[PDB]
Short mmCIF file of C-alpha atoms and ligand atoms in Angstrom, two decimals:
data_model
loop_
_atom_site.label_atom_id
_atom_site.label_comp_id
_atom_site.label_asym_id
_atom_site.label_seq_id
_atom_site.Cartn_x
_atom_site.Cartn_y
_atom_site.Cartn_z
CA UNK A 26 8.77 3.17 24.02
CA UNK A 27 12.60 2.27 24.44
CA UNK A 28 11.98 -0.73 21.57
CA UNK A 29 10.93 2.22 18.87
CA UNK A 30 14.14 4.55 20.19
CA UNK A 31 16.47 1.98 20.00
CA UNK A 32 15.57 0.85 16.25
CA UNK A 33 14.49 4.85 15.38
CA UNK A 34 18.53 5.71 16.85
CA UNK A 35 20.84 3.15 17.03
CA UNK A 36 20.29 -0.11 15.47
CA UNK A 37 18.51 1.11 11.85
CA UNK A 38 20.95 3.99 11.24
CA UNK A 39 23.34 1.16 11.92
CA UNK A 40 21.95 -1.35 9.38
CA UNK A 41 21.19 1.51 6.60
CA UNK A 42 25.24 2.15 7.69
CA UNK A 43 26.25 -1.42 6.51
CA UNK A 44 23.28 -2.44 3.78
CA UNK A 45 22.43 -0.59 0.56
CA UNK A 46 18.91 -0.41 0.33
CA UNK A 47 17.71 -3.61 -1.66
CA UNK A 48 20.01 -5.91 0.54
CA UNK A 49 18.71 -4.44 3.56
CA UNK A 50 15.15 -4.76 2.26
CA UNK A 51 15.82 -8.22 1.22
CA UNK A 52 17.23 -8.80 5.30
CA UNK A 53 14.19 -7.52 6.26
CA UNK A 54 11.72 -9.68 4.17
CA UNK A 55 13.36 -12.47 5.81
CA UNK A 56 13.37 -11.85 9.14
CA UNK A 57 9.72 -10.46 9.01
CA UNK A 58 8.98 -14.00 6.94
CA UNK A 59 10.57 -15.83 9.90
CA UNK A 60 8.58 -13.27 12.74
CA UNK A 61 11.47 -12.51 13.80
CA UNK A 62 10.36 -9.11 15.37
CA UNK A 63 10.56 -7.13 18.45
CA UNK A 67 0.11 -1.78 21.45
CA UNK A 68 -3.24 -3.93 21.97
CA UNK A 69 -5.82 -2.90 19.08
CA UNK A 70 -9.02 -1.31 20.93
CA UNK A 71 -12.42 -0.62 19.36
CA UNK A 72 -11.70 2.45 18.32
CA UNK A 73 -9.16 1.67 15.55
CA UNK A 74 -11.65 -0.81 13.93
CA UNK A 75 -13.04 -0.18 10.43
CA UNK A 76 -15.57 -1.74 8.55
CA UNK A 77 -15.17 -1.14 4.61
CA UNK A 78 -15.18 -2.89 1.18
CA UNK A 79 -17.21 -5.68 2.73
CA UNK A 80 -14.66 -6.59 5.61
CA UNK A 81 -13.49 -5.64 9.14
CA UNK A 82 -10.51 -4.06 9.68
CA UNK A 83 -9.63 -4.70 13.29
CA UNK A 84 -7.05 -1.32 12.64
CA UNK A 85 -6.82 0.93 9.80
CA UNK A 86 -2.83 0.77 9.58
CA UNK A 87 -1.83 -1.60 6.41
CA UNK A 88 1.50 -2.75 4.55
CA UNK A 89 1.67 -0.64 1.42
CA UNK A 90 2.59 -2.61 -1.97
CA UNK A 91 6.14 -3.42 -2.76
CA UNK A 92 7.26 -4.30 0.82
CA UNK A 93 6.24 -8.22 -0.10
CA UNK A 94 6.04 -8.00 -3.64
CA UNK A 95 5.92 -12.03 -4.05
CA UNK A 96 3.28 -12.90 -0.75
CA UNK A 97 6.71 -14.08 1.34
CA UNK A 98 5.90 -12.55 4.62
CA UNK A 99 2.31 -11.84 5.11
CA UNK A 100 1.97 -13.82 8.19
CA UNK A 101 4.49 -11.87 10.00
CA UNK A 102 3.22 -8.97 9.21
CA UNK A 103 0.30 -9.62 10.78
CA UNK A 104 2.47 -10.34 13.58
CA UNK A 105 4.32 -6.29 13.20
CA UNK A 106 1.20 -5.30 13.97
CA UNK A 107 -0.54 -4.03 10.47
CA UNK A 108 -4.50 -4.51 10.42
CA UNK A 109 -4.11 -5.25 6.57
CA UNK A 110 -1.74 -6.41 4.36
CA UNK A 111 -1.40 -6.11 0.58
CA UNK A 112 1.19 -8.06 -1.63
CA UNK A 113 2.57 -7.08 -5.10
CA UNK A 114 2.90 -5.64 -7.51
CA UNK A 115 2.12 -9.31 -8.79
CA UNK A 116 3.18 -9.66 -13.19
CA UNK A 117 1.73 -12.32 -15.37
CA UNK A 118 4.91 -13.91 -16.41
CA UNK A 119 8.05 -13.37 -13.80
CA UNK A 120 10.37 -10.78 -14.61
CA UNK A 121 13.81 -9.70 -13.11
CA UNK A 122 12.56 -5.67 -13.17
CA UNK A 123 15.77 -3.00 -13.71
CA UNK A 124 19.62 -3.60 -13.16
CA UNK A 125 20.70 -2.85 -10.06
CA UNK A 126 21.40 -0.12 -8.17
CA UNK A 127 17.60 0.57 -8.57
CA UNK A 128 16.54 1.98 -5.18
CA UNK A 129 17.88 4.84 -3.36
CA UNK A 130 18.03 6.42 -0.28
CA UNK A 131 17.49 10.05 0.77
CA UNK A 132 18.47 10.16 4.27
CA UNK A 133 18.20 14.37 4.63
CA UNK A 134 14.96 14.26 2.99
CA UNK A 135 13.63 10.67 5.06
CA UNK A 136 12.43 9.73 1.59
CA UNK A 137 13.45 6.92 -1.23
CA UNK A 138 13.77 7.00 -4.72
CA UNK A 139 13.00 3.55 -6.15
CA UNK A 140 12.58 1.66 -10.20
CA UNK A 141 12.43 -1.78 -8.79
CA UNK A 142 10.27 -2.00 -12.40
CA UNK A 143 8.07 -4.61 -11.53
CA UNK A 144 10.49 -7.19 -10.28
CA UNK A 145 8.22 -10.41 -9.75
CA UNK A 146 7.71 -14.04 -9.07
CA UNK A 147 4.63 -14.16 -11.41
CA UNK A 148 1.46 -15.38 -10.98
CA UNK A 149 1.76 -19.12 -10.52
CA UNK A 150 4.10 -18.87 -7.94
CA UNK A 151 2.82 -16.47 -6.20
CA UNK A 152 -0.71 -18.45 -6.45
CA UNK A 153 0.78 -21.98 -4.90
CA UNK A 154 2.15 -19.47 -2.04
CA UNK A 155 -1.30 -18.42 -0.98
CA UNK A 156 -2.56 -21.96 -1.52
CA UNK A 157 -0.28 -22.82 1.38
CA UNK A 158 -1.83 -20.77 3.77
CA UNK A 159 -5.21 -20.14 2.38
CA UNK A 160 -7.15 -21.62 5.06
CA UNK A 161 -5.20 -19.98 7.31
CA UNK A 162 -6.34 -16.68 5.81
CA UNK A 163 -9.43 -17.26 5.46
CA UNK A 164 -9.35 -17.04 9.40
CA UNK A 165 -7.02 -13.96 9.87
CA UNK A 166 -9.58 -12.28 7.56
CA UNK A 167 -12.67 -13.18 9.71
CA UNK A 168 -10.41 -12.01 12.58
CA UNK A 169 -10.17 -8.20 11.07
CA UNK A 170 -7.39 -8.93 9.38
CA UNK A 171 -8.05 -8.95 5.74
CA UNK A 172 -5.52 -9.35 2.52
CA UNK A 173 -5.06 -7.31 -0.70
CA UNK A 174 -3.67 -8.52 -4.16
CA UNK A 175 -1.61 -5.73 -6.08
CA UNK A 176 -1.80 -6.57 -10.13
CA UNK A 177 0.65 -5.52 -12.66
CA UNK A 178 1.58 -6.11 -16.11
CA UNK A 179 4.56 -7.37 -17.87
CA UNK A 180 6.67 -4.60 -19.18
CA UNK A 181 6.46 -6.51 -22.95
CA UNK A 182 2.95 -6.84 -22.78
CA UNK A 183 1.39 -5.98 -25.73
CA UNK A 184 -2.14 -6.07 -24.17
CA UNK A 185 -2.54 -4.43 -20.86
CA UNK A 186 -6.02 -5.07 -20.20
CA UNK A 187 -5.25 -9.06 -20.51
CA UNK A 188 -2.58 -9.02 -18.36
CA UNK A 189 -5.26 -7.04 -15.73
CA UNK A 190 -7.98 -10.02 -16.22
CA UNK A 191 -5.36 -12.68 -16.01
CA UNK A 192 -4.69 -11.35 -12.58
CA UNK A 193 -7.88 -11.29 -11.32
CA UNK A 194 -8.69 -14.91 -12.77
CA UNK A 195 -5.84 -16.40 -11.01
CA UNK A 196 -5.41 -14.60 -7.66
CA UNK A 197 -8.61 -12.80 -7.27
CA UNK A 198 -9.58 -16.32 -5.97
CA UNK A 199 -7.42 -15.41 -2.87
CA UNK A 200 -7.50 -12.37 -2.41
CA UNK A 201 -10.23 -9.55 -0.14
CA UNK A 202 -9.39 -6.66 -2.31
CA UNK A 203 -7.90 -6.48 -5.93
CA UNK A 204 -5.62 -3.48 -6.86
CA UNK A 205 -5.23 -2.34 -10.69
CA UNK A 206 -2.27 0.10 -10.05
CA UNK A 207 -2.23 1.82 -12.87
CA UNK A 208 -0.11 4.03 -11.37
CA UNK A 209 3.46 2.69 -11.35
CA UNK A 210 6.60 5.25 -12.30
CA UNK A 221 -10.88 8.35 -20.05
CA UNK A 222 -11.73 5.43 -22.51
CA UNK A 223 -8.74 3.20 -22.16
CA UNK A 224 -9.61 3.13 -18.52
CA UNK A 225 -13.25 3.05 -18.90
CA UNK A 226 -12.30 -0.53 -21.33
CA UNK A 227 -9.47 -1.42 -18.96
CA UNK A 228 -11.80 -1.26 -16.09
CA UNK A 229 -15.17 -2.68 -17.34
CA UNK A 230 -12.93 -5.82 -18.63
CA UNK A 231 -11.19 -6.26 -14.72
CA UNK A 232 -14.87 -5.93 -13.37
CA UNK A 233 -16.21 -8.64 -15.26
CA UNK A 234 -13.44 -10.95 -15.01
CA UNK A 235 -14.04 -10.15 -11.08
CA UNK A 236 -17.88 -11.01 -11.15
CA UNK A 237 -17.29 -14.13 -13.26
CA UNK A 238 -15.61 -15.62 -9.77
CA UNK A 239 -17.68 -17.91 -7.05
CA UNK A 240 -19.25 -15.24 -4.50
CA UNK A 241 -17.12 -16.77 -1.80
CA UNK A 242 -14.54 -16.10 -4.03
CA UNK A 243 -15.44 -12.59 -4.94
CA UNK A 244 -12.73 -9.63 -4.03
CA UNK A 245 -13.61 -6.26 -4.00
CA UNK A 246 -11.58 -3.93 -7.02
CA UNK A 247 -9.87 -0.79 -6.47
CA UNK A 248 -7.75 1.87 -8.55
CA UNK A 249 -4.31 2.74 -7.21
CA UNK A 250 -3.56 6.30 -8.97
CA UNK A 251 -0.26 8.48 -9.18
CA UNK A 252 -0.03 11.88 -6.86
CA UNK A 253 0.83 13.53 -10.61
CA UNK A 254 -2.09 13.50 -12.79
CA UNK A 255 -4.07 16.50 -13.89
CA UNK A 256 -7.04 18.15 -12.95
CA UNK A 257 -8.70 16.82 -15.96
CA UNK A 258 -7.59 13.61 -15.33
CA UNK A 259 -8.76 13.26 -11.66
CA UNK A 260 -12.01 14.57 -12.59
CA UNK A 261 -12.15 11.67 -15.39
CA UNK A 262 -11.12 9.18 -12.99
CA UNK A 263 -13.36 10.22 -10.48
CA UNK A 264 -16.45 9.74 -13.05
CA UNK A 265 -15.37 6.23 -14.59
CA UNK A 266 -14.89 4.95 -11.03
CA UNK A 267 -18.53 5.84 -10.02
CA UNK A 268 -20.24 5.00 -13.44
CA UNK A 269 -18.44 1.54 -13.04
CA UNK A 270 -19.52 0.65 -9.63
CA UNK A 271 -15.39 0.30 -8.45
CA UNK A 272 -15.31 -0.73 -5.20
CA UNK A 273 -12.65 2.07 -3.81
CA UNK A 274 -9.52 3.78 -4.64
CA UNK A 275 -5.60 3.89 -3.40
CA UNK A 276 -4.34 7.46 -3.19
CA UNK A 277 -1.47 7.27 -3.98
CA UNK A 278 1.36 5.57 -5.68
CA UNK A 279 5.19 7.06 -5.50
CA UNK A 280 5.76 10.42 -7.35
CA UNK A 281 8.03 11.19 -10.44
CA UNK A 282 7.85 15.24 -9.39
CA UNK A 283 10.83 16.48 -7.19
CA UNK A 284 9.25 18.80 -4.89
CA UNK A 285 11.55 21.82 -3.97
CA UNK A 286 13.98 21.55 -0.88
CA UNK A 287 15.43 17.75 -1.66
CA UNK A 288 18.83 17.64 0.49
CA UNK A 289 19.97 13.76 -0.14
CA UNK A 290 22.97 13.82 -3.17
CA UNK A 291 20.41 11.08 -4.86
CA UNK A 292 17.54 13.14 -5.84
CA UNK A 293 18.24 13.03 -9.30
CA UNK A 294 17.97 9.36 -9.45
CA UNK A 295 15.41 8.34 -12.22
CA UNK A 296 12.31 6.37 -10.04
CA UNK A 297 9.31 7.38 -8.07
CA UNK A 298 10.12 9.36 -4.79
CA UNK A 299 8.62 8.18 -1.50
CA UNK A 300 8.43 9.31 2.31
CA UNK A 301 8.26 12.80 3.72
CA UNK A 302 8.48 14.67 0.57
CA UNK A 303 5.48 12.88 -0.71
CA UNK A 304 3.33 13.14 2.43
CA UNK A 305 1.15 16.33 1.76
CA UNK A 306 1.17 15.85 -2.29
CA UNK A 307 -0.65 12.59 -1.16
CA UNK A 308 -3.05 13.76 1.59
CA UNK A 309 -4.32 16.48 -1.54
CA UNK A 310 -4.84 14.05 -3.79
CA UNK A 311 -7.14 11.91 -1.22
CA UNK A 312 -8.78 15.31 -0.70
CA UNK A 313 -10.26 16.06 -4.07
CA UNK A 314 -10.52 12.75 -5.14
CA UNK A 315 -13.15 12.37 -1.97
CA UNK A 316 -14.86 15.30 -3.04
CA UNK A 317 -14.85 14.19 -6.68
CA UNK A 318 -16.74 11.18 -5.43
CA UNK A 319 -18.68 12.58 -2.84
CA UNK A 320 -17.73 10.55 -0.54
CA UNK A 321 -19.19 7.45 -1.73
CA UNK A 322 -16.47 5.69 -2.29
CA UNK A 323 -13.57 4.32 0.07
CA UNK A 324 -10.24 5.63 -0.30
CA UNK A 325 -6.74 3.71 1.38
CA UNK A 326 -4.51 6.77 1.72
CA UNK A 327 -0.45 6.20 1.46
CA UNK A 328 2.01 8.20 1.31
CA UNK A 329 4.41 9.24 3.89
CA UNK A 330 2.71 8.26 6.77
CA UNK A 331 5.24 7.93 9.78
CA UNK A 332 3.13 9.27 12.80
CA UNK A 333 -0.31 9.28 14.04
CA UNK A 334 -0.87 12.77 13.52
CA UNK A 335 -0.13 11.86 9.69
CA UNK A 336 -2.37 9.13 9.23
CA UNK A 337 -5.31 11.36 10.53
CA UNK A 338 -4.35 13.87 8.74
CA UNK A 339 -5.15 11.34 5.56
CA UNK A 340 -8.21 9.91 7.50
CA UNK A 341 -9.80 13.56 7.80
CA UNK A 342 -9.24 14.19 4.19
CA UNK A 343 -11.44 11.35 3.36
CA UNK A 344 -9.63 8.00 3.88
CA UNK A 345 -11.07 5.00 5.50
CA UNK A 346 -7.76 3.01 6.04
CA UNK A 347 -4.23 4.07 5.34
CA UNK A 348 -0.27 2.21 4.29
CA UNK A 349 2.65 2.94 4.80
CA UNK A 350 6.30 1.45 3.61
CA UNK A 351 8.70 4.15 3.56
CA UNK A 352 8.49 4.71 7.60
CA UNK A 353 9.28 0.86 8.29
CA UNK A 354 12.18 1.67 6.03
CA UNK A 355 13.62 4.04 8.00
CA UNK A 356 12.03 3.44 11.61
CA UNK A 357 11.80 -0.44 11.57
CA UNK A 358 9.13 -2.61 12.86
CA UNK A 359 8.02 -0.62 15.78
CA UNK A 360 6.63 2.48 13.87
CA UNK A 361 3.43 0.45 13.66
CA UNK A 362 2.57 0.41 17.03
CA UNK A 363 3.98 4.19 17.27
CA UNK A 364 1.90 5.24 14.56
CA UNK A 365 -1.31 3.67 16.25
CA UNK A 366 -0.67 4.41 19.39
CA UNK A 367 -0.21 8.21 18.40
CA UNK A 368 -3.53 7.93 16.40
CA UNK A 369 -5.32 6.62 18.77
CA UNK A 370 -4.58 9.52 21.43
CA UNK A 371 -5.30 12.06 18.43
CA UNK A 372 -8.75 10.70 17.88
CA UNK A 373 -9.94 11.09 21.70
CA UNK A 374 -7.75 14.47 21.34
CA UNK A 375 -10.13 15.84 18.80
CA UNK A 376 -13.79 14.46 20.15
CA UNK A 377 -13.69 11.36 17.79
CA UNK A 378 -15.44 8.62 19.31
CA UNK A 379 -13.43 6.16 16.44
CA UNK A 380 -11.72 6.30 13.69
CA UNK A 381 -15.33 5.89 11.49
CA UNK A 382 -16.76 8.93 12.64
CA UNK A 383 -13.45 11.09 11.47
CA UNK A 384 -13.60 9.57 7.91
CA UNK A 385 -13.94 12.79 5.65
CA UNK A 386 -14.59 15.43 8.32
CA UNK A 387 -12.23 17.95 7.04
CA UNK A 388 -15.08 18.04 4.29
CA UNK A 389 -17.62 18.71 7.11
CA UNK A 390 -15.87 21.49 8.77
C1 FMN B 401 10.74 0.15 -2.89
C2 FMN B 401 9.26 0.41 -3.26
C3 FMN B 401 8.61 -0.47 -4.13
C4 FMN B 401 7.26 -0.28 -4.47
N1 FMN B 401 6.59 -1.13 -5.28
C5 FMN B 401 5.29 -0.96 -5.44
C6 FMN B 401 4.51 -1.96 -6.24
O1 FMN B 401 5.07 -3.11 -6.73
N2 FMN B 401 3.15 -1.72 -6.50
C7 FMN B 401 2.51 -0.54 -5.99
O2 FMN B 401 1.22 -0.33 -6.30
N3 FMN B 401 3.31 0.41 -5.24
C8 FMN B 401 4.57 0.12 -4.94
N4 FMN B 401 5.23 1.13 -4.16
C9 FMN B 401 4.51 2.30 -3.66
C10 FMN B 401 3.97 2.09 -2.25
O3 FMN B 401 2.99 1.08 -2.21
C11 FMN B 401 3.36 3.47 -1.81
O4 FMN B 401 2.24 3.77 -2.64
C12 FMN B 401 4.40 4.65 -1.86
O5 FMN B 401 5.72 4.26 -1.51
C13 FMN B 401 3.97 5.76 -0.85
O6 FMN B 401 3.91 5.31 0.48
P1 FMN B 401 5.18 5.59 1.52
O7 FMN B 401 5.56 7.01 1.34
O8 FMN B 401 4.69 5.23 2.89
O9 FMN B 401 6.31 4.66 1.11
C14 FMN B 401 6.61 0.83 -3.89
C15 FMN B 401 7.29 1.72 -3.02
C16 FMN B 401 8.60 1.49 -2.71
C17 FMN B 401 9.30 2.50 -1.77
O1 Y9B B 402 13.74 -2.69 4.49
C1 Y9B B 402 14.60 -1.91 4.74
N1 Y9B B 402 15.22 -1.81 6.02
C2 Y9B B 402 14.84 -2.68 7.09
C3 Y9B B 402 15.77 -3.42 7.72
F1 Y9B B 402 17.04 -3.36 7.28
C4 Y9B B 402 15.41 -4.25 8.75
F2 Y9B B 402 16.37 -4.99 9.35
C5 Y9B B 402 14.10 -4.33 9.18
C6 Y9B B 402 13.73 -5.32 10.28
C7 Y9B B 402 14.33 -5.32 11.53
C8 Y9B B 402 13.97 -6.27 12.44
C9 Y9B B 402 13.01 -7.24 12.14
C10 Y9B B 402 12.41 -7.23 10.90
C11 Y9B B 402 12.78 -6.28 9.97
C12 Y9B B 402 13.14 -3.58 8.52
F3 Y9B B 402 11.85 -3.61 8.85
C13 Y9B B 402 13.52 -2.74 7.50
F4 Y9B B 402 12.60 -2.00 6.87
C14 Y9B B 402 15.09 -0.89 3.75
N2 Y9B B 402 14.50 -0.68 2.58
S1 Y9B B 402 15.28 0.50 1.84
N3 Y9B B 402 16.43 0.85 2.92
C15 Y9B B 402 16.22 0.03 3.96
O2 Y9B B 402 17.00 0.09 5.06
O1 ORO B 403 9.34 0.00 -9.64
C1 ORO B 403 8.41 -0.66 -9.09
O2 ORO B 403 8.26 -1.87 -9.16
C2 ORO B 403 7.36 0.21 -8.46
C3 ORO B 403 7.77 1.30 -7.81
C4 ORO B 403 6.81 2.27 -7.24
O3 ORO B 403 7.17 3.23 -6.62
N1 ORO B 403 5.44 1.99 -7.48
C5 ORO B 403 4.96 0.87 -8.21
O4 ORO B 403 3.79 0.72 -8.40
N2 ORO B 403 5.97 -0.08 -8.74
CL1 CL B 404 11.70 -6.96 -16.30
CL1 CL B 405 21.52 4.54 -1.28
CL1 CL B 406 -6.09 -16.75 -17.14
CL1 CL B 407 -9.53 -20.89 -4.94
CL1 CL B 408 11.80 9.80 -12.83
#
């Protein structure tokens, strides 16, 4: 469309000209709060998973609305699902600024936000607001997930975990433990998150996944992969930035201390849904993110085994109408390949 070249050209290379990244993101959490914004969902894009319909498989990844400001409008950009946080127990202010970075040559960021958040309680009477509200969006395929962290002088991890759950699992479709951020501990972590979940009402009751890094080890994938299915976790996000800096990084900020984002990620990610789908067996749902900008991208996730995908770094450099693009493009891909939807090409990479 002439909306995605004009933002893709003129007016976000402009912006990113003017605005260092957090003031631009800042911008852009306001206008998206106020729907100020610039592709018709068909049956093919819809996914049913973790108990809910997804009327299309393209969500907001964490960090974009770390404090539950602008869900409504993005609904409105287009995503099927959004997910909010990295929400802390207490608020914290996170790292001193400068403390995200861009990469221009690379169309990646480097970013150690460190867990800047409103807290719980605020973010809590914010979903309050509009929890009714919700409630319909999410019967309407258009579900919400809850990102938990912990407070960086939290002596007790697992606490801060089960406080989350306790205070916004009550509003939230999924839960996220992102344990990820840049075999027993989990296996306590975990069982203590799981029954603070199934201590809530049933109507109440979110579904709990693990958000993992794209740097762990064999051995550690393999122990992940057998806590998750001896605990009965609901699904896993694959994955979180990376601390690695692949070979071939052009932008002069690549050194910056943070987790790396975008492009560079991309394929780093889609490997990690890979084996941890096999590691599984396929029984049990994956959200893939990790530089997903194009259709052909989030398919590429989809075939390796995920049922829904994020992105963030694409709106970052693209704007708003990269989710429309990047449906649009995966919706021509599926018919492309024989796919009647995108259910039926969930995992067949493994099938081949
Ligand atoms: C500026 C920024 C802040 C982020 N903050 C969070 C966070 O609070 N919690 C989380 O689980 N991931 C967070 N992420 C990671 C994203 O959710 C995602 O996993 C990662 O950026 C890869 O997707 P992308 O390449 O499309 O950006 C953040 C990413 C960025 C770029
Ligand atoms: O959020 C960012 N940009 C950014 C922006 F500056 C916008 F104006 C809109 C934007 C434009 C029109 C309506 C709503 C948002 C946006 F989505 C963005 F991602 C951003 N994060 S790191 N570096 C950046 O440029
Ligand atoms: O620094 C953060 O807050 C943050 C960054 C990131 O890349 N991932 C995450 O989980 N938190
Ligand atoms: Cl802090
Ligand atoms: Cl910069
Ligand atoms: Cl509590
Ligand atoms: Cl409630
Ligand atoms: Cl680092």
């Amino acid at each position: 469309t002439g909306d995605e070249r004009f933002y893709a050209e003129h007016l976000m290379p402009t912006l990113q000209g003017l605005l260092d990244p957090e003031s631009a993101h800042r911008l852009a959490v306001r206008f998206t709060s106020l729907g100020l914004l610039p592709f018709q969902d068909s049956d093919m894009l819809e996914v049913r998973v973790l108990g809910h319909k997804f009327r299309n498989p393209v969500g907001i990844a964490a960090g974009f609305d770390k404090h539950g400001e602008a869900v409504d409008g993005l609904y409105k950009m287009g995503f099927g699902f959004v997910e909010i946080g990295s929400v802390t127990p207490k608020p914290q202010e996170g790292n001193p600024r400068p403390r995200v970075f861009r990469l221009p040559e690379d169309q990646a960021v480097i970013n150690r936000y460190g867990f800047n958040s409103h807290g719980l309680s605020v973010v809590e009477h914010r979903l309050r607001a509009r929890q009714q509200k919700q409630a319909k969006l999410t019967e309407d395929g258009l579900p919400l997930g809850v990102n938990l962290g912990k407070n960086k002088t939290s002596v007790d991890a697992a606490e801060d975990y089960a406080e989350g759950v306790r205070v916004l699992g009550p509003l939230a479709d999924y839960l996220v433990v992102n344990v990820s951020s840049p075999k027993a501990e989990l296996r306590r972590l975990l069982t203590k998150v799981l029954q603070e979940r199934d201590g809530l009402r049933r109507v109440h009751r979110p579904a709990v996944l693990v958000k993992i890094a794209p740097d762990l080890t064999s051995q550690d994938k393999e122990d992940i992969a057998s806590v998750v299915k001896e605990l009965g976790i609901d699904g896993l996000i694959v994955t979180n930035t990376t601390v690695s800096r692949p070979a071939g990084l052009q932008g002069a900020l690549r050194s910056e201390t943070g987790g790396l984002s975008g492009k560079p990620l991309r394929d780093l990610s889609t490997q990690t849904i890979r084996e941890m789908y096999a590691l599984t067996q396929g029984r049990v749902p994956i959200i893939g993110v990790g530089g997903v900008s194009s259709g052909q991208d989030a398919l590429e996730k989809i075939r390796a085994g995920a049922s829904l995908v994020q992105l963030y770094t694409a709106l970052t450099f693209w704007g708003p109408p990269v989710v429309g693009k990047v449906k649009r493009e995966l919706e021509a891909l599926l018919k492309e390949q024989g796919f009647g939807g995108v259910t039926d090409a969930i995992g067949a990479d493994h099938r081949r």
